Amino acid sequence: SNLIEVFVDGQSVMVEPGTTVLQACEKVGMQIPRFCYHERLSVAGNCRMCLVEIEKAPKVVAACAMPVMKGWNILTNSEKSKKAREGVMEFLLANHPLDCPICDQGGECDLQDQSMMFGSDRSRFLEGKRAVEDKNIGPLVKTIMTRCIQCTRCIRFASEIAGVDDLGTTGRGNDMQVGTYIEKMFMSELSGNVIDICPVGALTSKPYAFTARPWETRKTESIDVMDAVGSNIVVSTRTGEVMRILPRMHEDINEEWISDKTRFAYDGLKRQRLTEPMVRNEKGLLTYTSWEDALSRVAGMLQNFEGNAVAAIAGGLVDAEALVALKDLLNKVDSDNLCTEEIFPTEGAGTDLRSNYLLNTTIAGVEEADVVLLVGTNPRFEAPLFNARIRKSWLHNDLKVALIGSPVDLTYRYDHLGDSPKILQDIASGRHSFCEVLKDAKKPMVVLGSSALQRDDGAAILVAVSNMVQKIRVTTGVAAEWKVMNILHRIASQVAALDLGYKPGVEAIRKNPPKMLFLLGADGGCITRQDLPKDCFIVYQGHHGDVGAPMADVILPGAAYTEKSATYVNTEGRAQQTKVAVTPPGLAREDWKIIRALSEIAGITLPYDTLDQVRNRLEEVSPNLVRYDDIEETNYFQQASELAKLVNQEVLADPLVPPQLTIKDFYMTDSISRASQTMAKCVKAVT
Amino acid sequence: QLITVDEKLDITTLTGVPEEHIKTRKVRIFVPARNNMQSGVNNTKKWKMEFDTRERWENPLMGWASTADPLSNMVLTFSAKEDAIAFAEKNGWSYDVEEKKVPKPKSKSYGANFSWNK
Amino acid sequence: ITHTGQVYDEKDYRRVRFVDRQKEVNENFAIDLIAQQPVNEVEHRIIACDGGGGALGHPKVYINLDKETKTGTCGYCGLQFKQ
């Protein structure tokens, strides 16, 4: 049923109804040449470079457009469909400016190749060419738009994938130029994708203007650590320094798109970077020194102190492996004072059941939702490729989005229930109007951002939301595998840390001050040296000198996610593996080894000595860590609620506000981001 | 007449590889993704297994990149996942296969976006 | 010193090389030479730039000197053209 039988040259590939001519060719195995058609962008038919010849038909048809019918034979390599490409390519090239040795989409051109494969050997355009006027679309995208083949992919993406709706066509004839009518910069996250989506090199990346050329770039597939969506990405390295980071497709997490932060902050990765292990001098000024000396500075203090006296405050962007190597270590000194900077409420079941702290509705589940209750977070600037998810599911499907936060630019039409945590109780009472909407919904989903939890009444906010999820679930009678409650993070090493049993919040360190603290990539201000005991002996374990370095008795440089085979996990627990794109710089070493080595100098040696062994260690403390690309299906929401019901807390009237109110808030957050000259240029452009 | 051996063909002893690069080298079997830059999918067809990346220190005299790892630039191409796994086992290199992920079917129709309703 | 100012430094371990042997650097740096080039005034909205000499120049490109605000600069010669 619903299987149209059509012959792609005689292969009778039976396709579902509504399959476009092009889609049938894909299934049979072919790939019709194409300029204006992108899988996740609307069909436009602008180029008509895809003209094919259905058998027994007078004219050739537009592949991307004709829904294939029954009995058709899509002759693709006919004598006609080649004159329908040999003659289109004649036109695209005719008005094209031949500056291919300027166009940094040199080997990354879908127009030279298609020319070299579906085009003609020579030109007949003896007439003159046209020229358009380069304008400014911002500090990230260089629009040398005399290159544009008016394929309108940008105008689509800028409207359909991102809700900018700014880029547009202006004029008619051969001087239709697809640029902003007034010069207003294209400022939005998801902005850099235009580069990747324009097959022509008209608008390309300005930082990566002319640093390389694609054949040279060695491409290593790794994971996004800047944000907690854990978007898949490919790090393009030449002769050992990263030259660009461009998206690689993951259906569920980032489907071909990556954030503006995680593709222009590769520059931040190359400066203010720690490399040699310095140690404080007599005058207090830090001074370089060999590992042996720096490690025993730390080891000697570690042997002297014990229990509460020693602590860790793991920062963001720290790999899971390093985490388990820091816990084992501080556990052998009788200390469970292992704390992450982002406070996740842990008075009821927290960290114990693995659903209190994970989006239980997988990102691809935003597509099959019905009503989303965004509470206290700006997805646009905390998980940009999850904001897109709710963008697509509000457009192609029909999600009814509701926000209980600050009224904020969300790239879609949301319902602003209010800015007061109290309203949560209101809906729980059912008194609130939206109650009906939720009631009407069959597959609903609440999403509590981590930043709402970071306030003082965060424990109360989680409990209040869990009560509402409980009766939302009861009133809707939603099926068990549909999961209403989920919470999204904004720090890469938070789900991994909570997974390994790291207890969130520095609240424990606050009550009893540790003699020694091993900051592990922590650039947050959660504990300061004035706050620390008199000794204030703390040793920074990280890659960039930002806030923790200048207040550090020891500097043990580490690596970054471009420089180690570590594991990370995003918000719905999908563990993922970063691969080493570039060897770590200077004497700097992998985070897990520094801690295995410090343990050997200390004498409480950790069991693993190779990374497969540390992966085996992760397996004993936690399951997700070893199985990659695998979301964990079952969760235990019912017992979580019981403990939530026991917890009694007051939600203060102060409105819950996302810290990233507008996009300048977004550009600089983590260490690598802060160290970005490109991000800095972006910040001043906004200001 | 044929003889029976249940021993996984390991021929690490005949290949002639230095001991260090057979026991410390992890190779990954993966199908290459597509540079988002281009929309062609002819480079996402065959599986490839690639050895783990190693040191690339700058050269003092000319600043050229210098590498001490021989198996770095080597990427062997294998048509099917089963065959690539076999190469790792008999050559003795450790392997961590990544499942192919192919684009999910997506429903498209020019008429659908013309819908003012939605 | 050089074009991109290569300066093996007083503390580098490579400046050792020039000892008793001079360094290769360039006078008439190009960075300033086109800046020294007069702006080619034109009548037409768009103009070509063979680089001068056709086959012995650069792949011909047409520059849009359409805004006096900006003198088009052929990406190959760095020649500014004054509408």
Binding site: E241, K270, R271, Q272, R273, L274, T275, E276, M278, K283, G284, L285, L286, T287, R529, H544, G545, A549, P550, M551, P585, G586 | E58, L61, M62, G63 | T2, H3, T4, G5, Q6, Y8, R14, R17, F18, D20, R21, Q22, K23, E24
Partner: peptide, 26 residues
């Protein structure tokens, strides 16, 4: 038509720049 040896050197710059320790003692 009618001492001077070319010493080879890298002309690129420093690339990775390390974080200068604060000269202010603490």
């Amino acid at each position: 038509p009618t001492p001077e040896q070319y010493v080879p050197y890298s002309t690129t710059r420093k690339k990775i720049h390390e974080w200068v320790p604060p000269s202010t003692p603490y």
